[PDB]
Amino acid sequence: TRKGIIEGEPTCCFECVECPDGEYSDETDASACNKCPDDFWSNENHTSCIA
Amino acid sequence: TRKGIIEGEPTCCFECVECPDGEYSDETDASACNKCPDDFWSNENHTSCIAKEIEFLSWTEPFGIALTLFAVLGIFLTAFVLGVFIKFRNTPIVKATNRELSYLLLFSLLCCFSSSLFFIGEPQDWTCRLRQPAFGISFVLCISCILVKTNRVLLVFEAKINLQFLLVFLCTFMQIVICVIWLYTAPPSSYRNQELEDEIIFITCHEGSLMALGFLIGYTCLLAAICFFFAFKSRKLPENFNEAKFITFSMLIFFIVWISFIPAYASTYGKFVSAVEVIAILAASFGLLACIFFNKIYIILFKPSRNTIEEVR
Amino acid sequence: EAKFITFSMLIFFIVWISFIPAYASTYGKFVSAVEVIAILAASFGLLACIF
Numbered sequence A: 001t002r003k004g005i006i007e008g009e010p011t012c013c014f015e016c017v018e019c020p021d022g023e024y025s026d027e028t029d030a031s032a033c034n035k036c037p038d039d040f041w042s043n044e045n046h047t048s049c050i051a
Numbered sequence B: 001t002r003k004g005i006i007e008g009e010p011t012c013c014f015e016c017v018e019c020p021d022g023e024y025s026d027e028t029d030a031s032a033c034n035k036c037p038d039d040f041w042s043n044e045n046h047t048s049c050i051a052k053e054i055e056f057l058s059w060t061e062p063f064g065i066a067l068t069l070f071a072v073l074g075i076f077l078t079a080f081v082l083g084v085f086i087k088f089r090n091t092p093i094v095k096a097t098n099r100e101l102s103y104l105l106l107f108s109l110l111c112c113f114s115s116s117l118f119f120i121g122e123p124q125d126w127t128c129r130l131r132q133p134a135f136g137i138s139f140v141l142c143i144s145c146i147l148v149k150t151n152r153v154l155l156v157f158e159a160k161i162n163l164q165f166l167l168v169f170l171c172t173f174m175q176i177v178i179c180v181i182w183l184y185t186a187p188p189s190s191y192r193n194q195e196l197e198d199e200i201i202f203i204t205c206h207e208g209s210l211m212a213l214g215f216l217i218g219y220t221c222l223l224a225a226i227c228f229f230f231a232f233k234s235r236k237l238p239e240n241f242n243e244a245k246f247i248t249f250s251m252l253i254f255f256i257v258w259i260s261f262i263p264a265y266a267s268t269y270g271k272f273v274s275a276v277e278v279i280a281i282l283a284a285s286f287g288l289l290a291c292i293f294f295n296k297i298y299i300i301l302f303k304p305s306r307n308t309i310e311e312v313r
Numbered sequence C: 001e002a003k004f005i006t007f008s009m010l011i012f013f014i015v016w017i018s019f020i021p022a023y024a025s026t027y028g029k030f031v032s033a034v035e036v037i038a039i040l041a042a043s044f045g046l047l048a049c050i051f
């Protein structure tokens, strides 16, 4: 999951938004979902890449 | 495009990230992209919601055009043969081939060629409910007439006991009983499909109970097998210009088509599934027609000098 | 040998015509599968009809 802006609040306050299909986020507090390289796709938990 | 967070910088300092495929966004400086509701999909620009593509085998698609053309050709041929027999209702061939059941058989062939047309277009509830029972009843009628014409079937039937109309009534009535139980217990209905591809919609019929369809198909195949067995037993008799040999040929064609049906149905994915159905129907129907009538047609219209009781032997 | 040649060709045509929707609506292993089946069917028909 990535961090989403809550309008009208500082940077500290955010929301958790699940990454879209084919995108992974291994690290906690990620500001951008990561694109799997070619020949790889996202998991069911959208954490890492599976060939 | 939505707003992403640049870490370590204030909220005024943001990044522009394009919406994913499925969600859209129109308002400027949007925080998160908006999910697009059902029956709707997002365009490439992810700015609005366009309608999903509803697709099915249609009357205007070229494949459906060809299917309709062949079905109509079959109907025309059946009507031609029926008219030829009706006009010659007293010539020796028509009298010997029991013109009443020939009229009934041509009627059922018309019904089969017509039921071939319920698989084209957008499926509705009545269409789905009529699809299978119509073909089942019509083809059981055809096979029952053929089975009556076959030699030694009638003698065996009366020994186990017009009687021929009783036979055709029994067969068709058993099929109608199956169809009525099917339509009463768990009728089929149309179904919209969105899990094949996320962007398009498939209207496919959903058969209520597969057990009833299995019963229908099995009974039709059983009748065909009985007819083939008896025709093979009497396959050398030159009666009716070797009618039993051509009955055998028609049954072989039927079985060949409906055995080829299984891999073709299994491998087909999408709308063309219904396609396969129609093709199978047509082939079987056409075979019947030819194997039962064209020879007789050729002896009557062209070279009509063999239309004598002696050669009917 | 008339009705044997006729039936071999009939099997050939029926097999190759019933698979048109599958060839027009399939990708990957299955399409190749279809080809093999068609081939085998035609071949068998020929043999079973002729010899």
Ligand SMILES: CCCCCCCC/C=C\CCCCCCCC(=O)O[C@H](COC(=O)CCCCCCCCCCCCCCC)COP(=O)(O)OC[C@H](O)CO
Binding pocket: B245, B249, B253, B279, B280, B283, B284, B286, B287, B290, B291, C001, C002, C003, C004, C006, C007, C013, C014, C015, C017, C018
């Ligand atoms: C998915 C399916 C697609 C396929 C579509 C096909 C669907 C339609 C099926 C069948 C129709 C007719 C089939 C009937 C087959 C029966 C033909 C047959 O076996 O007859 C033999 C000889 O006949 C003969 O002259 C044989 C003459 C051969 C003529 C048959 C041609 C069939 C053409 C149809 C093609 C249309 C496709 C259209 C697709 C767009 C028997 O003789 P015999 O040795 O006992 O002694 C007799 C001798 O005279 C005495 O010495």
Ligand SMILES: CC(C)CCC[C@@H](C)[C@H]1CC[C@H]2[C@@H]3CC=C4C[C@@H](OC(=O)CCC(=O)O)CC[C@]4(C)[C@H]3CC[C@]12C
Binding pocket: B286, B290, B291, B294, B295
């Ligand atoms: C319209 C399409 C999709 C299928 C319908 C079949 C037709 C193509 C017709 C036209 C030519 C017909 C054939 C023309 C001649 C004969 C000869 C006839 O020969 C015999 O074996 C009988 C003995 C004799 O004729 O001496 C058998 C039927 C058959 C094959 C007919 C069966 C039906 C056929 C194949």
Ligand SMILES: COc1cccc([C@@H](C)NCCCc2ccccc2Cl)c1
Binding pocket: B132, B135, B136, B207, B213, B216, B217, B220, B221, B258, B277, B281
């Ligand atoms: C073989 O004799 C028949 C008797 C009744 C119907 C038919 C044809 C017109 N449909 C086959 C039904 C095909 C089928 C098989 C399994 C699951 C769903 C479906 Cl749809 C043939």
Ligand SMILES: [Ca+2]
Binding pocket: A008, A009, A010
């Ligand atoms: Ca504030």
Ligand SMILES: [Ca+2]
Binding pocket: B008, B009, B010
């Ligand atoms: Ca700073």
